[PDB]
């Protein structure tokens, strides 16, 4: 996929500002989650507690973000930005506010009552693709990845899909091979793709669906988006 260069260019201009409104809604959603960390039993409950108007506003801000700035895969891809020179130059300075925008796109995806969490899937895979650097922040991404896998295949209204489709449908890349072209060291070195294809195969075969509790899921998501937020991804 090609990120519209004009729209991405607009994002450079409105970056710090959209980032600010973004961190507003994060602090809200996160504060509201702090009150009810045991009554929020599922995304739908997260929704009711937030309020329709808060929710409606949440989706409208995400809509403008998505349409105006060309984010076809719903969020920001640091692997993509690091890979393609034109985008690197455009964004190399703006890593801090980019992390904020992505956080927002991650957090509100917790509201997806289909449990597909396409945006969280994107963010986790992007993290997995980005890391060459020595980190155990990787480990956390693998774990969160297995949870998203449970959440997807544990919901019986979600169609059976291959590991390939599960991975690529949320990435601005066209094939599994292509991922080898844009990834960091860890992806190739630890044969990460095979681990994911394995995990995905076993989770949809297993009668055990040891899904985590939502408030624990949410807390792990918030935690993970926070670690990400103090990591230097752009080279
Ligand atoms: Co588990
Ligand atoms: Mg794709």
Tokens of 60: 């409208």
Ligand index nearest the alpha carbon of residue 178? 2
Tokens of 105: 């796109």
CA 223 to ligand 2 center in whole angstroms:
27
User: What span, in angstroms and rounded, lies between the C-alpha atoms of 8 and 14?
Assistant: 10
How many other C-beta atoms lie within 10 A of the C-beta of residue 103? 24
Ligand index nearest the alpha carbon of residue 174? 2
The dihedral over CA atoms of 204, 224, 123, 78, expressed in degrees to the nearest 10, equals -150
| Residue 151 contacts residue 168 (beta carbons within 8 Å) | no
CA 182 to ligand 2 center in whole angstroms:
13
DSSP readout, 17-32?
Answer: HHHHHHHHHHHHHHHH
Ligand index nearest the alpha carbon of residue 144? 1
DSSP readout, 83-126?
Answer: HSHHHHHHHTT-HHHHHHHHHHHHHGGGG-TTS--HHHHHHHHH
What is the resolution in angstroms? 2.3
User: What span, in angstroms and rounded, lies between the C-alpha atoms of 82 and 160?
Assistant: 33
User: What span, in angstroms and rounded, lies between the C-alpha atoms of 87 and 83?
Assistant: 8
DSSP readout, 45-73?
Answer: HHHHHH-HHHHHHHHHHHHHHHHHTT-TT
174-213: buried (b, 16+ CB within 10 Å) or exposed (e) per residue?
eeeeebeebbbebbeeeebbeebbebbeebbeeeeeeeee
Ligand index nearest the alpha carbon of residue 118? 2
CB-based contacts of 174, cutoff 8 Å, min separation 6: 1, 168
* Closest CA relative to residue 110, chosen from 196, 232, 223: 223
The alpha carbon of 200 is separated from its chain's Cα centroid by a whole number of angstroms, namely 18
Experimental method: X-ray
DSSP 171: S
CA 18 to ligand 1 center in whole angstroms:
36
């Amino acid at each position: 996929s090609i990120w519209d260069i004009e729209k991405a260019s607009l994002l450079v201009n409105d970056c710090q500002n959209i980032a600010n409104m973004a961190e507003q809604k994060v602090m809200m959603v996160s504060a509201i989650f702090s009150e009810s960390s045991k009554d929020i039993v599922n995304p739908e409950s997260f929704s009711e507690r937030l309020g329709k108007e808060t929710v409606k506003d949440l989706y409208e801000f995400n809509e403008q973000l998505t349409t105006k700035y060309g984010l076809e895969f719903r969020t920001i891809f640091f692997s993509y930005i690091r890979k393609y020179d034109a985008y690197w130059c455009l964004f190399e300075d703006l890593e801090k506010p980019l992390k904020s925008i992505q956080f927002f796109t991650g957090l509100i995806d917790l509201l997806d009552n289909t449990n597909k969490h396409l945006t969280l899937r994107s963010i986790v895979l992007d993290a997995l693709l980005s890391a060459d650097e020595e980190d155990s922040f990787y480990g956390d991404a693998l774990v969160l990845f297995e949870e998203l896998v449970i959440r997807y295949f544990g919901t019986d209204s979600n169609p059976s899909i291959d590991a390939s489709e599960f991975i690529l449908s949320c990435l601005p890349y066209t094939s599994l091979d292509a991922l080898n072209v844009v990834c960091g060291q860890v992806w190739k070195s630890q044969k990460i793709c095979d681990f994911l294809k394995s995990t995905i195969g076993n989770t949809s075969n297993s009668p055990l669906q040891l899904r985590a509790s939502f408030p624990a899921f949410v807390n792990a998501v918030i935690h993970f988006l926070l670690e990400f937020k103090n990591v230097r991804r752009l080279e």
